[PDB]
Amino acid sequence: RLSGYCGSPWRVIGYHVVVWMMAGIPLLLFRWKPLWGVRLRLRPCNLAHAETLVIEIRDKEDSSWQLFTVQVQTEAEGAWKDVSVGQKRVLRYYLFQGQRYIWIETQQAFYQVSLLDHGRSCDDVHRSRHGLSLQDQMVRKAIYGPNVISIPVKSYPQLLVDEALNPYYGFQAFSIALWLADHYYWYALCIFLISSISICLSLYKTRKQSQTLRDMVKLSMRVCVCRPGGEEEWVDSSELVPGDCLVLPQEGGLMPCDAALVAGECMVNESSLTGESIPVLKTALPEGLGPYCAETHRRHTLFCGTLILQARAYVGPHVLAVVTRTGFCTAKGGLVSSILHPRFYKHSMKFVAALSVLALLGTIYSIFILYRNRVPLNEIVIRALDLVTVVVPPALPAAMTVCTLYAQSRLRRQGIFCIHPLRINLGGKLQLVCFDKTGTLTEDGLDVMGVVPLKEPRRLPVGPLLRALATCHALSRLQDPMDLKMVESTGWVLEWEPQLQAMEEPPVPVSVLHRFPFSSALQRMSVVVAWPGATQPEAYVKGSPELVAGLCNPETVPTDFAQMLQSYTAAGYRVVALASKPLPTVPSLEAAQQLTRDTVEGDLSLLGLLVMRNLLKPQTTPVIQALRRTRIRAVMVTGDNLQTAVTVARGCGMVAPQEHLIIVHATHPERGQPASLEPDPRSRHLALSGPTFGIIVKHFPKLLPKVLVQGTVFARMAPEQKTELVCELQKLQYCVGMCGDGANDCGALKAADVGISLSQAEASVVSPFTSSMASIECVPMVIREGRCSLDTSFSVFKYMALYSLTQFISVLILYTINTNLGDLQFLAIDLVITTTVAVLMSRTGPALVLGRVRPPGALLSVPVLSSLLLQMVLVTGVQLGGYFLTLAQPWFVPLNRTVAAPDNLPNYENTVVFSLSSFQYLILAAAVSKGAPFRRPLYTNVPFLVALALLSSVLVGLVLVPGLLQGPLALRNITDTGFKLLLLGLVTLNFVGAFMLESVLDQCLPACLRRLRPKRASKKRFKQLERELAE
Ligand code: ALF
Ligand SMILES: [Mg+2]
């Protein structure tokens, strides 16, 4: 998807400002097709190099953005050899998608900023940065910009206009303004106050989100820069530019920006980028090859936001380092920069066409008053607008808001502490969930089962093994998690030497005299002891099994230690050797006093082996089984090695189909992906790797949809590629559930429609939902809550549509003769019946049984529409029949059809219609809520039946006994006759008919019959799955 740039500078004053001022009022059309708007402003045709208002052309792009160039304080090919030194003839830059874009006079075009990797910078000229040169420092600071993540504040004045113009937000305002013309102020205030409260709450939530996002990212530290002279000074982290000599302190913390090592090595603790916390050795970069692509040297480049544990000095005053990536183009900036700026119509057009048809149905009947009635002399303008706006209820968006906030409160009662009610209705339609082995799926700590070899619960064996195991702790427990777990497993308690005494030994304690230091070059940790227990002391040292085995030639060597090691490595186990060497007391005293290491490490003897396991939570397996039972496909994404991820997935027990992995090969312009095994078709599932996933992005000749559909386990996934994977998965109209606890998946969580974070910090800031529990058992609960919310929203929408249609038809029938159903009656029908019913019908939740059928994802199913149409025809037909019956029957006095105003309210025509229509809303409210399949049984939840019974009883009383409420309400007394009995019989027969219709339609018996056999392919996945399943 290519793009271009065009623009022109501001014009002189004159008629241009007049026309710009003119565009103030008619800019309502600027939302769509901005080409006319931009061409109607001060944007003439000029050169491509003297442009000021940069805009994007319509080169296979939609919704072009707009930006303003930033002025420059002062004005005056080798693939960007670094065209930027000094002051050029003209300097212009602008902000776009984070990193700014610089202008190059020689290229005559806007060249996107790229690192030295794109320019193919040779290594011969590198490795020579000994601090800042004589070149001006401000030039680099200005061109690259500050090393701070800029996030707009988005205050109230610049935020209201952005999120105060929605389709159902202008119509509501028009309806509110309409009421002031013809009284009815009581209803307007109720909507106005709730709308204002909702707007204020939304603004406050947006402001809080912006504030917490801005405060989350910030750099405040002082770094040391090695000057080329003979002095060093401290500088802030906000003035870091590439090509600067960085000095790493021996006890440094976080990494303000990316840097490359040139001398020495230092341990790293990458935790915000990779799930595994194993330290990685990063050495210098002595090389003389060609271009440095910064892709094949991951073992020498430090990423931003990485903690350093220990650093080793080298020859010279101190270690040296260089800066190669900083600003918005660094690793940390890229993840953040991909969130701020970056984030069918068939049903919408059908709905708008239906609304237009409904509006034009009544638009001509209203003007027909001149035919069968006397015109009110230009008073129909207000009446016509009222009829137009009554076709839908102004509180339609608010109808589901009560259900959404009730569901949010129910969730907040226990488990997830929701912050704002949103994205709940769409959360029920969940079919895939992403999990990571570390953090949530497995315990963070490392547990040791014990020593397998002897040449089960602890304390069983007797001998020097217990002393060796319990004394190997070089660092005292009290004055990493693995050491704590190891010391806890043995069951002992720890806290000549001050605080180096052992407990739980029947004999005198074995006290360690000195502890050897840990070094990167040497992985040996030896401990020397000496005790008066009339036994020769022993020396214990731990290290890699290979080294001890190789250097244990003089003594006995292990047998059959290769195949076991390979199997353990393939299974994810880590093998560590426990070497030992006896030493008498006298030589040991001198060895400890003189700090001798060569003499004690010359010969050793292994005693046992130790391994670690993830120790996954037991509660995970039932949750996974329940999730899979509902035809939900589970996928695993993690940055750990594929060897551990595959075995963890296999040990989960969810399912064991054929498993194969793609083997990575040497780099090549054309790459082939072969198969593997643990040609005959089977149920094997695809499993990609890290490099292959990133290589497939550039070209996708085939297997693009066929891979993600069967994708099961992904390993070594980069933090940036997770967003791309989420976008690719969502391109097929699919819902992806991103779950994690680290900060390396914030972009994926934001992109994903629904996500769960198990950490109170980091992911909690951006994740829509925050979980206070460290277990994955909440996903089924969230899915059930979303499904229940969607069902309740659908039921509420159906009820609101039915009520609106009934009200519109009742108004239309009465419009034939001069009537308006009064004012108090209308106010009661609106406020009382609607509010008391809608709220009470949306306070139910799912049961403890998980089903298989999932709710429809849209309100386009034919059964519901057919049922609604049948109900509408039935109600209108019964109303017409009742009107005909009451008209043919001889009544007391003819209606006064002289005055065309609501002054003759007392009459027999309005009384028989208002009361008859009142029961319809209550009847329909109790026949639109689903029962057994999704909601709880109706009888169990009975806050609403009592209210409905009371309302029906009071309505029957007021429509039976004269003088009860006929004074204030526009009702007329009726002589005691058999009309009431006939009305009650009609109501009862309609009730039973509607109930029978609902009961028969709920089973959806005709659905299967009508499904034989129109092929349905309204999906991007089922069509390909059908073809795949053929073979
Ligand atoms: F292994 Al993770 F987020 F914990 F990728
Ligand atoms: Mg995680």
From Swiss-Prot:
Its EC number is 7.6.2.-. It is found in: Lysosome membrane; Late endosome membrane; Endosome, Multivesicular body membrane; Cytoplasmic vesicle, Autophagosome membrane. InterPro entries: ATPase_P-typ_cyto_dom_N, ATPase_P-typ_P_site, ATPase_P-typ_TM_dom_sf, ATPase_P-typ_transduc_dom_A_sf, HAD-like_sf, HAD_sf, P-type_TPase_V, P5A-ATPase_N. Residues 31-163, 205-350, 408-793, 842-857, 933-943, 1002-1031 are cytoplasmic. It is a multi-pass membrane protein. Changing residue 717 to R: In KRS; some patients manifest neuropathologic findings suggestive of neuronal ceroid lipofuscinosis. Changing residue 436 to N: Loss of ATPase function, autophosphorylation and protection against mitochondrial stress. Accumulates in an inactive autophosphorylated state. The presence of spermine results in a dose-dependent reduction in autophosphorylation. Residues 10-30 dip into the membrane without crossing it. Its main location: membrane. Changing residue 930 to A: Reduced spermine-induced ATPase activity. Changing residue 276 to A: Autophosphorylated but displays limited spermine-induced ATPase activity and lacks spermine-induced dephosphorylation. Expressed in brain; protein levels are markedly increased in brain from subjects with Parkinson disease and subjects with dementia with Lewy bodies. Detected in pyramidal neurons located throughout the cingulate cortex (at protein level). In the substantia nigra, it is found in neuromelanin-positive dopaminergic neurons (at protein level). Glycans are attached at residues 896, 973. GO terms for biological process: autophagosome organization; autophagosome-lysosome fusion; autophagy; cellular response to manganese ion; cellular response to oxidative stress; cellular response to zinc ion; extracellular exosome biogenesis; intracellular calcium ion homeostasis. Autophosphorylated. Accumulates in an inactive autophosphorylated state and autophosphorylation is stimulated by phosphatidic acid and phosphatidylinositol 3,5-bisphosphate but not by Mn(2+) or Zn(2+). The presence of spermine results in a dose-dependent reduction in autophosphorylation. GO terms for cellular component: autophagosome; autophagosome membrane; late endosome; late endosome membrane; lysosomal lumen; lysosomal membrane; lysosome; membrane. Gene3D superfamilies: Calcium-transporting ATPase, cytoplasmic domain N, Calcium-transporting ATPase, cytoplasmic transduction domain A, Calcium-transporting ATPase, transmembrane domain, HAD superfamily/HAD-like. Disulfide bonds: none annotated. Mg(2+) binds at residues 741, 745. Changing residue 110 to L: In KRS; decreased protein stability; loss of autophosphorylation; increased degradation by proteasome; novel location to endoplasmic reticulum; loss of lysosomal membrane location; impaired autophagosome-lysosome fusion; impaired degradation of protein aggregates. Belongs to the cation transport ATPase (P-type) (TC 3.A.3) family. Type V subfamily. PANTHER family: CATION-TRANSPORTING ATPASE-RELATED, POLYAMINE-TRANSPORTING ATPASE 13A2. It is linked to Kufor-Rakeb syndrome: A rare form of autosomal recessive juvenile or early-onset, levodopa-responsive parkinsonism. In addition to typical parkinsonian signs, clinical manifestations of Kufor-Rakeb syndrome include behavioral problems, facial tremor, pyramidal tract dysfunction, supranuclear gaze palsy, and dementia. ATPase which acts as a lysosomal polyamine exporter with high affinity for spermine. Also stimulates cellular uptake of polyamines and protects against polyamine toxicity. Plays a role in intracellular cation homeostasis and the maintenance of neuronal integrity. Contributes to cellular zinc homeostasis. Confers cellular protection against Mn(2+) and Zn(2+) toxicity and mitochondrial stress. Required for proper lysosomal and mitochondrial maintenance. Regulates the autophagy-lysosome pathway through the control of SYT11 expression at both transcriptional and post-translational levels. This is Polyamine-transporting ATPase 13A2. It comes from Homo sapiens. The lineage of its organism: Eukaryota, Metazoa, Chordata, Craniata, Vertebrata.
